[PDB]
Amino acid sequence: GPDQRAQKKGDIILGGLFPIHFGVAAKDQDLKSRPESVECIRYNFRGFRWLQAMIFAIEEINSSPALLPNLTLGYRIFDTCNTVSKALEATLSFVAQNKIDSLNLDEFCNCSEHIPSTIAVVGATGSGVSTAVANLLGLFYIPQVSYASSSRLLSNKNQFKSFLRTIPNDEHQATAMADIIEYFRWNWVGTIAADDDYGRPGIEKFREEAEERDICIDFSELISQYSDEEEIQHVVEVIQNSTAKVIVVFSSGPDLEPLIKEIVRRNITGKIWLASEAWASSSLIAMPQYFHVVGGTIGFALKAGQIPGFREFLKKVHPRKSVHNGFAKEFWEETFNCHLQEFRPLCTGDENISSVETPYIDYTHLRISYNVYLAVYSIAHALQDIYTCLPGRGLFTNGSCADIKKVEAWQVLKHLRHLNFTNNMGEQVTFDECGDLVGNYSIINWHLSPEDGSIVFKEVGYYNVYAKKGERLFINEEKILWSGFSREVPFSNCSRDCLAGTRKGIIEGEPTCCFECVECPDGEYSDETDASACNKCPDDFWSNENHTSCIAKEIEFLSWTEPFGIALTLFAVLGIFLTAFVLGVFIKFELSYLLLFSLLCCFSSSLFFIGEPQDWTCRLRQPAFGISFVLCISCILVKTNRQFLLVFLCTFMQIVICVIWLYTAPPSSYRNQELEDEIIFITCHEGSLMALGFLIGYTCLLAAICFFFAFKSRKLPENFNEAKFITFSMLIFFIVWISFIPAYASTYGKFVSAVEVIAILAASFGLLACIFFNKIYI
Amino acid sequence: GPDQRAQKKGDIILGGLFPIHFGVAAKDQDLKSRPESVECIRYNFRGFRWLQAMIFAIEEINSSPALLPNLTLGYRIFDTCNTVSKALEATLSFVAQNKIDSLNLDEFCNCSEHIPSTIAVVGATGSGVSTAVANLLGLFYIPQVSYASSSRLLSNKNQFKSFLRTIPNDEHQATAMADIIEYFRWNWVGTIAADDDYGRPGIEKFREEAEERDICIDFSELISQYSDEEEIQHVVEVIQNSTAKVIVVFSSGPDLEPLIKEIVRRNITGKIWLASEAWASSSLIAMPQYFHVVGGTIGFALKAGQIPGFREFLKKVHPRKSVHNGFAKEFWEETFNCHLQEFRPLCTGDENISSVETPYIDYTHLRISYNVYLAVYSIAHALQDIYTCLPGRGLFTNGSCADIKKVEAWQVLKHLRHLNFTNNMGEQVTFDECGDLVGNYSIINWHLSPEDGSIVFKEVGYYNVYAKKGERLFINEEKILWSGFSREVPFSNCSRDCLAGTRKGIIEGEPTCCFECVECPDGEYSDETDASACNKCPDDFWSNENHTSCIAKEIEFLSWTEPFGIALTLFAVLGIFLTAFVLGVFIKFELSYLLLFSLLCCFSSSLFFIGEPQDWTCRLRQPAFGISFVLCISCILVKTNRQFLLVFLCTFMQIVICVIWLYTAPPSSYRNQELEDEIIFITCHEGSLMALGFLIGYTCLLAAICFFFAFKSRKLPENFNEAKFITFSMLIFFIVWISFIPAYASTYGKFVSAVEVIAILAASFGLLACIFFNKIYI
Ligand SMILES: *[C@@H]1O[C@H](CO)[C@@H](O[C@@H]2O[C@H](CO)[C@@H](O)[C@H](O)[C@H]2NC(C)=O)[C@H](O)[C@H]1NC(C)=O
Ligand SMILES: *[C@@H]1O[C@H](CO)[C@@H](O[C@@H]2O[C@H](CO)[C@@H](O)[C@H](O)[C@H]2NC(C)=O)[C@H](O)[C@H]1NC(C)=O
Ligand SMILES: *[C@@H]1O[C@H](CO)[C@@H](O[C@@H]2O[C@H](CO)[C@@H](O)[C@H](O)[C@H]2NC(C)=O)[C@H](O)[C@H]1NC(C)=O
Ligand SMILES: *[C@@H]1O[C@H](CO)[C@@H](O[C@@H]2O[C@H](CO)[C@@H](O)[C@H](O)[C@H]2NC(C)=O)[C@H](O)[C@H]1NC(C)=O
Ligand SMILES: *[C@@H]1O[C@H](CO)[C@@H](O)[C@H](O)[C@H]1NC(C)=O
Ligand SMILES: *[C@@H]1O[C@H](CO)[C@@H](O)[C@H](O)[C@H]1NC(C)=O
Ligand SMILES: *[C@@H]1O[C@H](CO)[C@@H](O)[C@H](O)[C@H]1NC(C)=O
Ligand SMILES: *[C@@H]1O[C@H](CO)[C@@H](O)[C@H](O)[C@H]1NC(C)=O
Ligand SMILES: *[C@@H]1O[C@H](CO)[C@@H](O)[C@H](O)[C@H]1NC(C)=O
Ligand SMILES: *[C@@H]1O[C@H](CO)[C@@H](O)[C@H](O)[C@H]1NC(C)=O
Numbered sequence A, B: 001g002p003d004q005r006a007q008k009k010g011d012i013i014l015g016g017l018f019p020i021h022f023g024v025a026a027k028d029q030d031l032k033s034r035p036e037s038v039e040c041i042r043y044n045f046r047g048f049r050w051l052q053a054m055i056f057a058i059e060e061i062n063s064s065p066a067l068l069p070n071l072t073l074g075y076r077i078f079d080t081c082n083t084v085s086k087a088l089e090a091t092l093s094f095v096a097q098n099k100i101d102s103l104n105l106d107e108f109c110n111c112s113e114h115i116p117s118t119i120a121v122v123g124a125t126g127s128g129v130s131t132a133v134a135n136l137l138g139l140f141y142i143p144q145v146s147y148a149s150s151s152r153l154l155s156n157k158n159q160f161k162s163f164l165r166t167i168p169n170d171e172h173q174a175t176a177m178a179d180i181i182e183y184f185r186w187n188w189v190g191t192i193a194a195d196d197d198y199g200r201p202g203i204e205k206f207r208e209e210a211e212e213r214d215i216c217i218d219f220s221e222l223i224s225q226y227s228d229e230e231e232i233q234h235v236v237e238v239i240q241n242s243t244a245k246v247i248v249v250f251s252s253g254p255d256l257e258p259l260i261k262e263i264v265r266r267n268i269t270g271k272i273w274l275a276s277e278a279w280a281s282s283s284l285i286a287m288p289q290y291f292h293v294v295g296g297t298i299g300f301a302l303k304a305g306q307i308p309g310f311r312e313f314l315k316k317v318h319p320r321k322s323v324h325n326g327f328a329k330e331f332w333e334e335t336f337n338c339h340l341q342e343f344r345p346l347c348t349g350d351e352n353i354s355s356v357e358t359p360y361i362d363y364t365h366l367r368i369s370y371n372v373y374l375a376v377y378s379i380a381h382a383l384q385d386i387y388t389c390l391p392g393r394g395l396f397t398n399g400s401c402a403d404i405k406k407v408e409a410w411q412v413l414k415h416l417r418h419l420n421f422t423n424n425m426g427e428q429v430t431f432d433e434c435g436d437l438v439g440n441y442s443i444i445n446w447h448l449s450p451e452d453g454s455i456v457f458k459e460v461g462y463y464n465v466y467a468k469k470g471e472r473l474f475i476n477e478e479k480i481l482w483s484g485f486s487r488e489v490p491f492s493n494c495s496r497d498c499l500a501g502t503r504k505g506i507i508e509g510e511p512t513c514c515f516e517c518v519e520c521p522d523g524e525y526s527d528e529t530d531a532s533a534c535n536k537c538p539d540d541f542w543s544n545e546n547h548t549s550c551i552a553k554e555i556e557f558l559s560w561t562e563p564f565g566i567a568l569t570l571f572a573v574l575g576i577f578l579t580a581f582v583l584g585v586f587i588k589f590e591l592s593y594l595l596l597f598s599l600l601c602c603f604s605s606s607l608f609f610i611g612e613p614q615d616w617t618c619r620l621r622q623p624a625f626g627i628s629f630v631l632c633i634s635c636i637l638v639k640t641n642r643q644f645l646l647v648f649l650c651t652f653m654q655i656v657i658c659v660i661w662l663y664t665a666p667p668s669s670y671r672n673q674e675l676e677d678e679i680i681f682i683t684c685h686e687g688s689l690m691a692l693g694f695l696i697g698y699t700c701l702l703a704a705i706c707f708f709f710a711f712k713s714r715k716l717p718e719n720f721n722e723a724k725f726i727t728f729s730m731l732i733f734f735i736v737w738i739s740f741i742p743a744y745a746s747t748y749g750k751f752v753s754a755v756e757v758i759a760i761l762a763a764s765f766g767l768l769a770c771i772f773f774n775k776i777y778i
Helices: A045-063 A084-094 A127-140 A171-184 A200-213 A229-240 A253-266 A310-315 A328-335 A368-387 A409-416 A563-588 A594-608 A615-619 A623-637 A648-664 A690-713 A722-739 A749-776 B045-063 B084-094 B127-140 B171-184 B200-213 B229-240 B253-266 B310-315 B328-335 B368-387 B409-416 B563-588 B594-608 B615-619 B623-637 B648-664 B690-713 B722-739 B749-776
Strands: A006-008 A075-077 A144-146 A163-165 A188-193 A216-221 A246-250 A272-275 A420-422 A428-430 A441-448 A455-463 B006-008 B075-077 B144-146 B163-165 B188-193 B216-221 B246-250 B272-275 B420-422 B428-430 B441-448 B455-463
Touching (some): A045 A310, A084 A127, A084 B127, A127 A144, A127 A163, A127 B084, A144 A368, A171 A200, A171 A272, A171 A441, A188 A200, A200 A216, A216 A229, A229 A253, A594 A623, A623 A648, A623 A690, A623 A722, A623 A749, A648 A690, A690 A722, B045 B075, B045 B310, B045 B368, B127 B144, B127 B163, B144 B368, B171 B200, B171 B272, B188 B200, B200 B216, B200 B246, B216 B229, B368 B409, B563 B749, B594 B749, B623 B648, B623 B690, B648 B690
Parallel strands (some): A188 A216, A246 A272, B188 B246
Antiparallel strands (some): A441 A455, B006 B075, B420 B428, B441 B455
């Protein structure tokens, strides 16, 4: 028992376990010398006022005779300054009078002290520490109740049989941790836990929250308060080497603390902080000297509990009045940084309490203090139930309660499994199967007092714990300032929600949290910013310039009343009117009715075989063979060796061949798709070979017959040598049919049939000239 | 202290911790009743003879006065039947007299017993148990030395400061575990560990061994002795649902035991067993009732240690002589299954020792027994060093040894850090930084005694521990029988080493342990069975039928002396000889010298323009134009309107045009690659247009000139109307040059130039007929 032992007598010893220092030295006893304990080198005024709260509620339960009359209460309280070694050293001293069943050597002077047993005990802060000692207490079923350890591992009543707590489990915390960025709607996030049993199981639970919500986890590192500076350099190189503005820290204070100093030295700004409440209310972190990089820190916290007499008991302090305190004197000379002694001067003992800004007194709220304060009263209330035994009707084997003069900690734990009673602020606080309770969490922001530069902890909503899943959250969205000041929401996806036409693909190797969006052209119709694929639009439709919705058309190659064709139709109509005036002058002065009608019919069927494409407008290509063959038969049968009925042995033979090709030809336009951008066309789908066959067998045959007959008439001037102009009209016309063999066989595009139509029309006009002009010039 | 407490007095208490039962019951005290200890329901005769070995070496060290004269040795030995709860209950009773520094209430009658302290202690079997108690003993620096716990975690002297052992670390075990299948050269393997701190760190170390050796791990499951039958069904569904004949089990006995029963019920055969030595010497596993599926089990083991008096002390047993034993009576009535009492009858106490086949006595070897037996002697030897203090020159702060009448366990541990002494079988057994030693491992096989059906454990090699990495292994390959009997090696890759031409690719999604081999055709040259890709072979070479090495050629289209061309050359030579006899008869009876030489030169240049392709053999196509144009000029200039020098105004004009085309033509064969399989060709790379230009401007021009001149001579019989046969020879020849316009313009393959050559040759023969026959038939 050190001078840090905190003890006063009483009928039930309690004992408590507390971090008087955050840090412990790591000196190495090297065993040529005798070993000894190691110094613990930090402080925790929050822990010291937890002690003050402990003995305060001790004083309440002793003084207030409604709370257990005629009974005084022992305690032997020790200083677990985050060292499980010292914790073990403590708890062995705890289970000594409880270990008197195994003690079998010291009979006649154990009664020389006759010290009773510690029937239950306050638990501890650190989860690893409490799990260390829970293994010891599960032997003896000593009821131990932690005030701060809140891991899901301790719910295992197989190993940790004898353990309850006064704090909710971490699972709703990890739940709401997923839910707040579910609200904040992000994809690329990175987390940090601590290297312990508070960091690892909580981050595993939260990792499964994230894998429900499908968030590409950028990193997951573990830390301690005794970490390597090279490892800290490694993880800050990770932090500088990643794309995650959001940072989940799921640690305690002193574990993030060297990382905090390393960052405020290293000075990376912009990354923002989800906060574990183990450090989210901690002025060693919450420093103005740190606030140049920390701000907008968002954490849960327990609601503030209120204690009558709290600050009063805090200021009821004196070093000479330390009748039962362990570290009052060190506390006095440490707060005041002097050296009272029974350089650093002799302390007055009378220095003003609020002359210093101590976190013993600098609080705004009471949370784990409050948990302690209610925890001891829950112990007192189960013991009050034991005090008020129902007479043979208790919770025992046949209800026989133990007497208060001879109690049993297993029976204590039996009553502790079932407790149902109200709080000092009127909350019916029961104990579930985990042996805890659960309240809501104020979700806070880390703002600054503009009057003083003091970091103020400003709630921007709260997480209810009583609604359904997906129903337990409140957001005060109004007081939200992202990164402390900026009311606008930042970005923690990996890729952007891209542009419209960029079809949102994926990236192989990388999770689909981060992906690509492929710029899909040429009929995509992709106007949604996150369309995964494209849309193949309709056949008359082609995409916009940004590969957007399709409005643009394909080709429209018809050329019905085109402006190029208007002048050619004017030339054709002029030739028709000139031929009409010529025929009028000739009739006043077969060549006027039949041959002139065949020539003007091949010149009017050339006009009718232009225009738009249709079925019959496609099928109309026959009369340019027929009427022109009749006009050519007029030339081949107006010879001097003298025809309608008699040279119909040729002409009607070609006419029956024309009826055969009329039966054989296909009467249907063909709007083909030759190209793809300028796709549509008109092709007229002609049947097999009837056009070239009729051309060779009629027109070229008549030209050859006229040449073979007029081979003698060329060297024979008859009717002023009309064979010369006859063979010249045949030269123009056979030049058409044999040079637009190559020209209309070497045509292209929407002028292909137009070229043959112009060839036939010009050949008609030229034959009309070289025949009728030579006929009727005089 | 139970009746299982094992105690006799003496100046230094030792204490030991042992599994009297494998299994402990899991009854649930439900706290309406008073709690109590839980029964431990199994047995371990190997542990009971470990006790016998313990007290045997105790007896040695007491009796043998060379080992510590004038000093008696206490012990208080307890029964850690694999229950860490009972272990904790034990070790608290251990550190009680050592905990007398904290004991501050029992002064005047602690001396009523005056019990001294337990200065050191035997460790424990289970790694979890020893790590539990090592946390307790690191407080007091009580030197604890395990006999069976062998995990690498305990080498951490930060937490486990006060711990040494008598067993090598698991790292060489995992090393050799990689090395044996490295020898056995496999790729797809699956492992099984246990759900503890012996299974998990060992399988992590071995997993990193495997990831060095790059073996696709099929599965990794964890087990315990208290596992769920649904989980056992899950992992046996994994075992039936995988492709891994090799199975690494890295557990203890009772963890694999329910899996062993589940498998021998479930009856899957064929899978083979790498073995952790914690169960590889265990007759509960090594059952003949199990040997129907277990066999060929290959495990390491520690070498056999030998103890004088071993079996002797084993048979020095009696229940009434149990002057210090804990479980002798239960052992007696459990071995004999009777009920001696101070139904199951009253035991005689005189039953024959080897009347039963008990694994207390059924051994072949002594291993962990031997570790215990040497461990206590190492303790005795460090204490013998303490007994022989060097007078002020010890290992202390200035060498002042502690007296033996007042000792200190920290000083004990200081001397225990440095020990250097020989074994009973003469091994200088020191203690390293882990505080252990390391010997080789007999690598055994699980064969069967054919005389008795007894499972015999047959070494097939050993793993040395003193050579280098990659040097520490011996294999007796001769006694290797895979799966117990089969001397041939099995298969534990995933894919096969495939066929030759199948180019060994990979599989996306699956590790390259298991992969594909793509059947690569068409010039692969892939004759290696595991070639990753193919080989593009030479241009004259094409792959075999199995896409193997390329030997097959491409095309060889040359046709120099082909058998089809031999008969045509015979026809040409026959026409030449007939023309020679015809010219001889005509000269005896320009047409004989010049025109006949031009015709026979176009008929001999047709022969010279056949054969193989070369540069000049390509360039030779000019003379078929030249000499035939001279022969045609003979026909066009032997007219009746009468030539060499005068019609050279045409003929020499064409000859200068022929010299111009001779300058313009390219003289080079072109072995092109038209196809790819039958690739090679011959194309002769002719220059631009000189052939068609010379043809039209000379041959067709001369034919037109002859027709336009003989238009009158056709209707004119002169020299018996030779214009008829003249125009008939021109009909054959212009039919050649104007129909092999289409035929030699519509040719294909290696007969393309052959067709034009045959056309020119036949045209020469036909012109020779239709001229010279009509000339000289009479
Ligand atoms: C980060 O990624 C998530 C996933 O797409 C985005 O959440 C989407 O938000 C839009 C509206 O903002 C909703 O219509 C979608 O239904 C959400 N997706 C899912 C899967 O629910 C989020 O918006 C992204 N962040 C930013 C800043 O755009
Ligand atoms: C925790 O959150 C609950 C919300 O489920 C709070 O409930 C409030 O209850 C009062 C009276 O029952 C209502 O008037 C309020 O409207 C409720 N608040 C809501 C619905 O947001 C509850 O007070 C909170 N605190 C505790 C300790 O339970
Ligand atoms: C299982 O896979 C390994 C990996 O390829 C094979 O080991 C190869 O064995 C051949 C000869 O057997 C050696 O030439 C190679 O060098 C080995 N590979 C490596 C990476 O070293 C093994 O042979 C395969 N098993 C079977 C049965 O073929
Ligand atoms: C462990 O293996 C070593 C091999 O490194 C054994 O060494 C033998 O040593 C003797 C004498 O020194 C030699 O004659 C043998 O040839 C060695 N065996 C070999 C090289 O295989 C050693 O005996 C083994 N056992 C122990 C306990 O160390
Ligand atoms: C840290 O970085 C921020 C980023 O702008 C900068 O404003 C600030 O001055 C930096 N501080 C130090 C100490 O480098
Ligand atoms: C009532 O209590 C007695 C004594 O404790 C016990 O023997 C008895 O079994 C109990 N009765 C029942 C019904 O449990
Ligand atoms: C027990 O708890 C229920 C629910 O909170 C409550 O209604 C009841 O009054 C409680 N009983 C006692 C005795 O506290
Ligand atoms: C188990 O399977 C093996 C496989 O052939 C078979 O030989 C053996 O008879 C089976 N045993 C039982 C009990 O099903
Ligand atoms: C020798 O031993 C004495 C007493 O133990 C000690 O005071 C002294 O420092 C030692 N000398 C040295 C050099 O360590
Ligand atoms: C110490 O160990 C070394 C190496 O085994 C040996 O040579 C030496 O003899 C040992 N000394 C003693 C005193 O055992």
